[PDB]
Amino acid sequence: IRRIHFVGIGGAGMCGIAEVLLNLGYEVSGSDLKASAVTERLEKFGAQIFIGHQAENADGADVLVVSNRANPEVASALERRIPVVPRAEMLAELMRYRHGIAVAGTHGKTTTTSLIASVFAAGGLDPTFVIGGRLNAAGTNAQLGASRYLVAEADESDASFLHLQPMVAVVTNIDADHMATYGGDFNKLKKTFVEFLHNLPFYGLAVMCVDDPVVREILPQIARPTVTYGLSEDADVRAINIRQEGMRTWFTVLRPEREPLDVSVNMPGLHNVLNSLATIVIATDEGISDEAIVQGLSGFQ
Amino acid sequence: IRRIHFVGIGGAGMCGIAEVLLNLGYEVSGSDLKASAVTERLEKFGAQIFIGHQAENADGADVLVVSNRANPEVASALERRIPVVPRAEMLAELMRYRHGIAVAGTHGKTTTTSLIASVFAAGGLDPTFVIGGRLNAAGTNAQLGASRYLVAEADESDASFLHLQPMVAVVTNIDADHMATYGGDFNKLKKTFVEFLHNLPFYGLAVMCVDDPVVREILPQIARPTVTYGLSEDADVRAINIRQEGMRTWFTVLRPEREPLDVSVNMPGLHNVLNSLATIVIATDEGISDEAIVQGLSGFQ
Numbered sequence: 001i002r003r004i005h006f007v008g009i010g011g012a013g014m015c016g017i018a019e020v021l022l023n024l025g026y027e028v029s030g031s032d033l034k035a036s037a038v039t040e041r042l043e044k045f046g047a048q049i050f051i052g053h054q055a056e057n058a059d060g061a062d063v064l065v066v067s068n069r070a071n072p073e074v075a076s077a078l079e080r081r082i083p084v085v086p087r088a089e090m091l092a093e094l095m096r097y098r099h100g101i102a103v104a105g106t107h108g109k110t111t112t113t114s115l116i117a118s119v120f121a122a123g124g125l126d127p128t129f130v131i132g133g134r135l136n137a138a139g140t141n142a143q144l145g146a147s148r149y150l151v152a153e154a155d156e157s158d159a160s161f162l163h164l165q166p167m168v169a170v171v172t173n174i175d176a177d178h179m180a181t182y183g184g185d186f187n188k189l190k191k192t193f194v195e196f197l198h199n200l201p202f203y204g205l206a207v208m209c210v211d212d213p214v215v216r217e218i219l220p221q222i223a224r225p226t227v228t229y230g231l232s233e234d235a236d237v238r239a240i241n242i243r244q245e246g247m248r249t250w251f252t253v254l255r256p257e258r259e260p261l262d263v264s265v266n267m268p269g270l271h272n273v274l275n276s277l278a279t280i281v282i283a284t285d286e287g288i289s290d291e292a293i294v295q296g297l298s299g300f301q
Numbered sequence: 302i303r304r305i306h307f308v309g310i311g312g313a314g315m316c317g318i319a320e321v322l323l324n325l326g327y328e329v330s331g332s333d334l335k336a337s338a339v340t341e342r343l344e345k346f347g348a349q350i351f352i353g354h355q356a357e358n359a360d361g362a363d364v365l366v367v368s369n370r371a372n373p374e375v376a377s378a379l380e381r382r383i384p385v386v387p388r389a390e391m392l393a394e395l396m397r398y399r400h401g402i403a404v405a406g407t408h409g410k411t412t413t414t415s416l417i418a419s420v421f422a423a424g425g426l427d428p429t430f431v432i433g434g435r436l437n438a439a440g441t442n443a444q445l446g447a448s449r450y451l452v453a454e455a456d457e458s459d460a461s462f463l464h465l466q467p468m469v470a471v472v473t474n475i476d477a478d479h480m481a482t483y484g485g486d487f488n489k490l491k492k493t494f495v496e497f498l499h500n501l502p503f504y505g506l507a508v509m510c511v512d513d514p515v516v517r518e519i520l521p522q523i524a525r526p527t528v529t530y531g532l533s534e535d536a537d538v539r540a541i542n543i544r545q546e547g548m549r550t551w552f553t554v555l556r557p558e559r560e561p562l563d564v565s566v567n568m569p570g571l572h573n574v575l576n577s578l579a580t581i582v583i584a585t586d587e588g589i590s591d592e593a594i595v596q597g598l599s600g601f602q
């Protein structure tokens with residue numbers, strides 16, 4: 001099923017997805033009420049761009065991506081049983097094409113994703129990453145999705161949470177913010193994180209913050225390879241000798257079968273220590289050098 | 302040493318302290334640049350109020366409390382070797398006269414203090430409490446300090462942190478925010494919390510959140526009676542079956558040798574669950590009924 005049509009393709013949450021789909025070799029079309037430098041760039045990359053809203057624009061589409069069900073393109077598709085997918089659902093689908101790193105947890109997804117992208121780029125890898133629903137690739141010279149790697153926040157309040165297919169998954173922590181997504185029941189919310197980590201392939205990797213008592217409780221249920229991290233004495237990957245020099249936080253990272261590595265980050269708080277530990281677990285498992293880790297962490301603001 | 306003089310006694314951080322000192326039977330004087338309803342109320346309660354700044358106002362004072370060392374009252378005192386105490390230092394001194402509950406921890410001091418005050422007032426006790434450096438007594442009909450109980454935030458960045466003399470102390474968590482107070486060294490910061498809890502009398506009580514990995518690490522060093530709390534399976538006082546009904550969070554509190562008690566609070570997040578657990582530990586140790594606990598927790602916004 002080769003042809004994908006975006007209604008409102010100039011939206012800031014929509015153009016990135018189309019660009020990645022163009023990069024994967026799909027035929028991509030889109031409509032929007034006005035031409036912009038965004039549609040122009042998508043056309044330069046191979047997208048067919050309509051500047052009206054009319055049923056004829058939906059012709060030939062195998063799937064629609066939308067972010068108004070009375071809109072005539074959507075109706076024409078619905079009446080023709082063409083699948084109509086929400087933007088968030090197609091975003092999560094992109095992870096199947098790449099080596100996906102899913103950053104889950106109630107808090108710290110945004111920073112931990114940016115740090116991972118920061119270190120991987122220091123290692124030459126130019127990853128694509130998703131913050132706030134936007135596809136990104138810091139300083140890239142290429143179409144979104146060029147990199148083998150795709151780092152993304154994985155929000156448990158998101159309808160697509162359990163349809164991510166990552167190779168590696170972080171769980172920073174598990175809070176009760178989104179109980180209402182799960183019937184108002186924190187125990188139902190914990191069971192979803194267990195199911196989420198079981199979307200990993202058996203060769204995948206789950207990166208678990210055992211400083212969180214709720215992460216620590218579900219850890220023995222995870223039939224996937226795991227590395228634990230935190231300040232806890234029993235974490236696989238730990239931070240010790242936390243210190244401050246200026247607006248910068250220093251600490252020593254302990255890692256199994258490695259010498260201790262002094263790192264530093266420009267952001268205060270134990271939570272950014274933990275964001276950096278999670279990043280260090282990912283980077284190490286992937287084979288990235290200490291120089292890239294050290295540089296990636298200290299480069300970020 | 303009976304007579305205490307406040308320079309700038311109309312300040313919002315200063316009038317409360319003078320009022321408590323009046324309530325303890327001290328002679329209290331003060332100066333300020335302008336008469337206000339605050340100075341008027343202090344005069345109605347027995348304070349002598351000067352409306353100028355001049356050395357003669359400092360005459361007879363045994364101690365000064367200030368919040369400008371060129372000010373003539375301070376100079377007259379300094380030249381006369383009269384002690385000159387910062388406002389924060391005299392605030393912490395008040396705890397010696399009462400049954401002091403010190404709410405320490407990097408995060409959650411404000412909410413946990415207000416919840417404790419909320420439950421104690423539900424129990425008829427009309428406590429005085431300190432948020433943000435301000436003495437408070439919700440709906441009281443009395444001078445500040447009338448109650449036997451004084452609940453106060455205990456900030457580890459505060460110069461007076463280690464001169465609190467509480468009967469009971471909470472440690473919600475231990476973060477690195479204030480490393481710069483302690484030479485930029487988190488390990489120096491942890492040692493201070495250990496020393497702080499040892500300001501408790503041997504019959505005192507330390508209430509420790511063992512969900513915090515740093516609290517959990519120093520726990521075995523505390524030669525004082527301790528009750529631990531959190532979601533951890535091994536906490537003395539735990540929250541289980543967390544659920545949501547509207548904008549309200551429900552959970553069941555487990556307590557040693559007590560039946561489980563369903564409580565609820567109007568604020569979301571596991572952190573307010575923990576604030577409520579800490580409050581429930583304090584209230585229970587003090588002998589307060591379930592009705593006051595339940596009412597105190599659900600009354601607060």
Ligand SMILES: CC(C)c1cc(Nc2nc(N[C@@H](CO)C3CCCCC3)nc3[nH]ncc23)n[nH]1
Nearest residue numbers: 107108111172173209211270271272274275278
């Ligand atoms: C607050 C918000 C802006 C955030 C959080 C954050 N990161 C993380 N927060 C947490 N839990 C924290 C609760 O907020 C605290 C932090 C201190 C140690 C005790 C737990 N655990 C984590 N593990 N790995 C990453 C990560 N970044 N930004």
Ligand SMILES: CC(C)c1cc(Nc2nc(N[C@@H](CO)C3CCCCC3)nc3[nH]ncc23)n[nH]1
Nearest residue numbers: 408409412473474510512571572573575576579
């Ligand atoms: C954030 C800020 C506005 C705050 C914090 C707060 N209270 C507490 N926070 C913490 N740590 C938290 C880090 O913020 C998290 C919360 C979730 C479980 C994992 C730890 N532990 C606690 N123990 N007792 C009270 C209390 N109230 N408000």
